[PDB]
Design a protein around this ligand. Structure first.
Ligand SMILES: COc1cccc(C(=O)N[C@H]2C[C@H]3CC[C@@H](C2)N3c2ccc(C(=O)NCc3ccccc3)cn2)c1C
Ligand SMILES: COc1cccc(C(=O)N[C@H]2C[C@H]3CC[C@@H](C2)N3c2ccc(C(=O)NCc3ccccc3)cn2)c1C
Lengths: 204, 204
């Protein structure tokens, strides 16, 4: 297990998200689904010139998995995945630029999507987020952070996932509405209805 | 005809786009098509709760219309359109916030889309841009700017659009490659292949 410091602007943004009241927190699910959709676009595009890209799994989909016993909501996709370097260095498109100005726009949370840092909206509703991911060119890794200025990266020895990413949201006590079938259906309808991949909401 | 000064940050933005060389100009088309796709999502979503929102036209599509003789490329969509207030005040999502930090990021151009100001990428390839639009709640209007810090708004008397927006790009002398069927097809395939509405090129 390696433990890393967040980029300064990201630590700042995370503190803001966790320690400030925002109303319309449901948009976290729109941002995660948007990210999954983009990751799906990426592998799909690569597959068009190299079909072997899909040897790690042909299905291109998004799954929503509420677990009331564990108090987790999991968003799984079979998109391009992330390498260990992605997990340590962050993705090129997440950087101080998108972050810096958005906080100054805050000081509605929903415009986070616009600035390419939508993932961190997960911290509106989750006390801890685990990102398990597998890219064609790397092994399976687990990234995790409960904020506090650091994240961990470790090999994931667990369930081999083929290719893609799982975001496990360990929900805050007062945010369990996001485990209810009806609430999740409503949010998907309102914000992610026309996403171009199947979104399957698991039943408990 | 009413003439308005741009918001300071937008003037700044446009000048930076126009007066600096950027290689990857083809992303303007991606941006315009992304804006059309979003506009189509918005009317489609309204239509689910009030079918009469489509009295102004049921088809949800994007058309690309090159015109070598006029040296124009027109991008038409049947999305939600914009009102006079939209054309004067700008859209809520385009704001000094998205703008200012993008410029500091600049000083890849492709990152423009991330920050909600993708429309202004048109000035990479166009000396003038005309936006003709019709929203269900308002009359048809023409918005126009050759940059240089001002734009105009007038009631539009031309061909009725029903509902939606036409962006007419009056191309720079050295950017006529974007009127070529081959080039347009290549760009759509590279950057817009999985857009969830039909994109149709009207060949000359
Ligand atoms: C399906 O698509 C997904 C799914 C799940 C997460 C993400 C995503 O946005 N991931 C990134 C943000 C979060 C989540 C995992 C990882 C990469 N991550 C990181 C990684 C590193 C950093 C970081 O701050 N690294 C240190 C650093 C220091 C100085 C400069 C730059 C980075 C921040 N966030 C995406 C795109
Ligand atoms: C299909 O989707 C389309 C198609 C065509 C254009 C657009 C779009 O992004 N339009 C906006 C940006 C461009 C193009 C039309 C209009 C609204 N527009 C404006 C309008 C006003 C302004 C402006 O600066 N107004 C003055 C102002 C001063 C001080 C504060 C705020 C505004 C800038 N851009 C979109 C979203």
């Amino acid at each position: 297990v390696e433990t890393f410091a967040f980029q300064a602007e990201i630590a700042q943004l995370m503190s803001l998200i966790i320690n400030t009241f925002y109303s319309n927190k449901e948009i976290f699910l729109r941002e995660l689904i948007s990210n999954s959709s983009d990751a799906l676009d990426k592998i799909r595009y690569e597959s068009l010139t190299d079909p072997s890209k899909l040897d790690s799994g042909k299905e291109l989909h998004i799954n929503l998995i509420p677990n009331k016993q564990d108090r987790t909501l999991t968003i799984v996709d079979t998109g391009i995945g992330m390498t260990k370097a992605d997990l340590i260095n962050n993705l090129g498109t997440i950087a101080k630029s998108g972050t810096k100005a958005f906080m100054e726009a805050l000081q509605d949370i929903s415009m986070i999507g616009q600035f390419g840092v939508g993932f961190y909206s997960a911290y509106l509703v989750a006390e801890k987020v685990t990102v398990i991911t597998k890219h064609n060119d790397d092994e399976q890794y687990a990234w995790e952070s409960s904020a506090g200025g650091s994240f961990t990266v470790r090999t994931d020895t667990g369930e081999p996932m083929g290719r893609g990413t799982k975001v496990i949201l360990h929900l805050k006590e007062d945010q369990t509405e996001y485990l209810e079938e009806r609430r999740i259906k409503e949010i998907v309808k309102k914000h992610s209805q026309f996403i171009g991949y199947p979104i399957t909401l698991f039943v408990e």
